[PDB]
Design a binder for these strands. Structure first.
Lengths: 167, 142, 209
RNA sequence: CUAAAUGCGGAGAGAUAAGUGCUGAAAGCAUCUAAGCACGAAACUUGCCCCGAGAUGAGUUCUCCCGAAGGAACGUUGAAG
RNA sequence: UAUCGACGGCGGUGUUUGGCACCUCGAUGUCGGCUCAUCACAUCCUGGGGCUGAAGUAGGUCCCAAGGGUAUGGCUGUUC
RNA sequence: ACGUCCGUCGUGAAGAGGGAAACAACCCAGACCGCAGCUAAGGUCCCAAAGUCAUGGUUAAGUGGGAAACGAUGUGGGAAG
């Protein structure tokens, strides 16, 4: 059993295999179904199976991690800061598609998954914030992925790329 | 030696039901499928139709043995090999029941051999009394 | 009435002031008696008849609808006496071409192109021919190569060859309707129309003109 | 009738491998995996054309019919053979 | 350790050759070519990738993969 | 080398019957006829006669065993510093 205390600005309610966390930033509902019973104590969320098998500890390490993740994503939130760079032709990054990358006539794009905001001010910094973590991390990774030289041209010579400043 | 009634066996066509509700699914494979060619009447021979359409009450509650689960698997599909396996679990296809107690009493054709014909006879479906609503003729109860 | 149908009579022409002289295919479009209409559904990609509408059946027309809204409905054909029709069934089934057909209107006419037995690769699926001296070598309509690598002495199923045909459906689009005239209620279609004379061809308001 | 003649012969959609990643333990770190998950091959499935109720889940519809409904035989010719 | 790669060691295949000779030995018309049908892969490319003594271009080598395409001619009966 | 060539012995040849999926020499075992009973080999979820038997443990690969030299924190058990 691994008791997980909940912040003063966090309210969690559970009904069966469904756990809902509420707060300021928003709400996140997740389902944890396994050979364990997750219950919420007035001051702490408890997770404790009956057996201590290896596989049982595996689901225990992820469960606690997921819960703690739902807590931070409600009080603080998930946001990644990225910056664009280019020595030569300025890469115009728009909320739709990036153009003039290294001088290529054709635009490189990627579909924005789920519902997160990627507001990009006319400068060097851009922000991708959302409620889901697996989403804000994918979109941020793909944005740099496409900035990766497809042809057989090594790095160093091609600086142009929008890397993530902070995780 | 020869004793056949006029063509065919449809006028005054017989019919029989069972209680799909509760009981082994094994001893439900036999019967039903024996009500067809040679229902057990002096009107068999064998070369013309006989298939005596049967009815299934409820096919959802029909529980299996309390041991065998993801033990038995059914391979359903056709076409090229080494592609789509489509291997689902029994109590997974239970989302029905429409294609279950008809997948059985279906494996005995054996291979045309008159059996294709044998299928539209019975009408598998989950429910109860108001299920036999469809098809409207006299009434029994085995 | 998604469209009408007639029988190919032959090919003529009409010189109209506007536009310019152009051959026209005469098609006999007449009285029909559609008793019912069969609707097909697109399960994956295998046609299947959903239901059939009789002189009076709201239980089938309802399913027909909605399914159309789902865009799952396939081509529509209805039990007819002479030729097809759609909304014509609901009325009485009895109708004339004059009821459905206007001229100068664009329409899509599809039909099965015109038994010819076995044919040569060329006369067959349009295979070209031995141009150059290749023709001089009197090897006109022959691929010259049943298949690569003599061993296998086999011809890749792909490697198209000769075979049987006749006894292909094609839907030519943008077919202007010159006019409806002749000894009998017919239709004048601009250009040519797939299939031989007497063949059954259908009409349909040009999807895009 | 033919050819050294002429008109016609898609796109698109769906799914894995190599591989690229996500979340994440066993080893409270890390990790593409071990459970789970997002993508990802001219080929594969489909589209499309052709055959097909002997398509063994062996079809559908309408009408006629159980002493008279219907049907075979013939004659004159083929858009047929 | 891009690439080439000895000495030595350990193996797979059985297309070559050698061996044995267990089988056939109560007879299944030769070689080459041609014509026509099916199968396989130790992929020469197309497709997707790794490395480079990879600037680019053009190549070299290697991996997954055989779906398709892998197809021809001049001299010689001739298979080099 | 389903090789040649010796020796001892049991068999193939007159070993039927039974098991081994099928099988000349591998295992058990060696026959008058008819009848009852009990066993051998082997087998006891179904086809197939007989337990889907009891206690305990391991494997997940369906491994159900050509499969080699060689390799292996896939996983389980035991002992030693």
């Amino acid at each position: 059993k691994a008791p997980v205390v909940v912040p003063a600005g966090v309210d969690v309610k559970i009904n069966g295999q469904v756990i809902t966390i509420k707060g300021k930033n928003g709400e996140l509902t997740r389902t944890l179904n396994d050979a364990v019973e997750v219950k919420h104590a007035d001051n702490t969320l408890t997770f404790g199976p009956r057996d201590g098998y290896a596989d049982g500890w595996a689901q225990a390490g992820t469960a606690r991690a997921l819960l703690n993740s739902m807590v931070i994503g409600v009080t603080e939130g998930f946001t990644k800061k990225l910056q664009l760079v280019g020595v030569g032709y300025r890469a115009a990054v728009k909320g739709n598609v990036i153009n003039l990358s290294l001088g290529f006539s054709h635009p490189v794009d990627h579909q924005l998954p789920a519902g997160i905001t990627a507001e990009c001010p006319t400068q060097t910094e851009i922000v991708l914030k959302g409620a889901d973590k697996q989403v804000i991390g994918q979109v941020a990774a793909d944005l740099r992925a496409y900035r990766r030289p497809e042809p057989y041209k090594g790095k160093g010579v091609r600086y142009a790329d929008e890397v993530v400043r902070t995780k | 030696m020869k004793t056949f009634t006029a063509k065919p066996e449809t006028v005054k066509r017989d019919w029989y039901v069972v209680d799909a509700t509760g009981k082994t699914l094994g001893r439900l494979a036999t019967e039903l499928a024996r009500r067809l060619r040679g229902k057990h009447k002096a009107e068999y021979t064998p070369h013309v139709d006989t298939g005596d359409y049967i009815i299934v009450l409820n096919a959802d509650k029909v529980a299996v043995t309390g041991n065998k689960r993801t033990d038995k698997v059914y391979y359903h599909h056709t076409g090229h090999i080494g592609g789509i396996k489509q291997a689902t679990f029994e109590e997974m296809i239970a989302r029905r029941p429409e294609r279950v107690i008809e997948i059985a009493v279906k494996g005995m054709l054996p291979k045309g051999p008159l059996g294709r014909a044998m299928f539209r006879k019975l009408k598998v479906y989950a429910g109860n009394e108001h299920n036999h609503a469809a098809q409207q003729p006299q009434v029994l109860d085995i | 009435m998604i469209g009408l149908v007639g029988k190919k009579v032959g090919m003529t022409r009409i010189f109209t002031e506007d536009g310019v002289s152009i051959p026209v295919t005469v098609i006999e479009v007449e009285a029909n008696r559609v008793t019912q209409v069969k609707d097909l559904a697109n399960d994956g990609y295998r046609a299947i008849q959903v239901t059939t509408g009789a002189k009076k059946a709201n239980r089938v027309t309802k399913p027909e609808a909605g399914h159309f809204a789902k865009a799952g409905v396939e081509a529509g054909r209805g039990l007819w006496e002479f030729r097809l029709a759609e909304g014509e069934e609901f009325t009485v089934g009895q109708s004339i071409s004059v009821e459905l057909f206007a001229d100068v209107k664009k329409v899509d006419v599809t039909g099965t192109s015109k038994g010819k037995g076995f044919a040569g690769t060329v006369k067959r699926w349009n295979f070209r021919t031995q141009d150059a001296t290749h023709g001089n070598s009197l090897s006109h309509r022959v691929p010259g190569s049943i298949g690569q690598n003599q061993t296998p002495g086999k011809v890749f199923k792909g490697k198209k060859m000769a075979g049987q045909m006749g006894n292909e459906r094609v839907t030519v689009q943008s077919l202007d309707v010159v006019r409806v005239d002749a000894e009998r209620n017919l239709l004048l279609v601009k250009g040519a129309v797939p299939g031989a004379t007497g063949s059954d061809l259908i009409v349909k308001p040009a999807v895009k003109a």
